[PDB]
Amino acid sequence: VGLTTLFWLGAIGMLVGTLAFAWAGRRYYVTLVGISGIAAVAYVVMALGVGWVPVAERTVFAPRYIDWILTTPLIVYFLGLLAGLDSREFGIVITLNTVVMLAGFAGAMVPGIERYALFGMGAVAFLGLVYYLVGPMTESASQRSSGIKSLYVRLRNLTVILWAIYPFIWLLGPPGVALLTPTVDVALIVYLDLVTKVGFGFIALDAA
Ligand X SMILES: *C/C=C(C)/C=C/C=C(C)/C=C/C1=C(C)CCCC1(C)C
Residues in contact with Cl ion by CB under 5 A are 60-61
Q: Give whichever of 49 and 120 is closer to ligand X, judged by the CB atom.
A: 120
CB 196 within 8 A of CB 159: yes
**Residue 28 interface partner, choices Cl ion, ligand X, none, CB cut-off 5-8 Å depending on type:** none
Nearest-approach distance from CB 134 to Cl ion, in angstroms: 28
Closest separation in Å from C-beta 44 to ligand X: 15
Binds 167: which of ligand X, Cl ion, none (CB < 5-8 Å by kind): ligand X
HSE value, Cβ hemisphere, 13 Å, CA-based, for 138: 14
Question: In the complex, what is the shortest distance from the CB of residue 208 to ligand X, in angstroms, rounded to a whole number?
Answer: 21
Nearest distance from C-beta of residue 190 to ligand X, angstroms = 11
Q: What number of residues does the chain have?
A: 208
Q: Toward Cl ion, which CB reaches closer, 128 or 182?
A: 182
| Interface contacts to ligand X, rule CB under 6 A | 39, 68, 71-72, 100-101, 103-104, 119, 122-123, 126, 163, 166-167, 170, 193, 196-197
Please say which residue, 46 or 141, places its beta carbon nearer to Cl ion: 46
Of 25, 44, 46, nearest to 201 (Cα)? 25
Among Cl ion, ligand X, none, what does residue 61 contact (CB within 5–8 Å per kind)?
Cl ion
CB atoms within 10 A of CB 135: 10
Detail the DSSP E strand segments found in 35-190: 52-55, 58-61
Angle at 123 between CA 122 and CA 126, to 5 degrees: 85
Separation of alpha carbons 191 and 189, rounded Å? 5
Q: Which residues are bridge partners to 53 per DSSP? A: 60
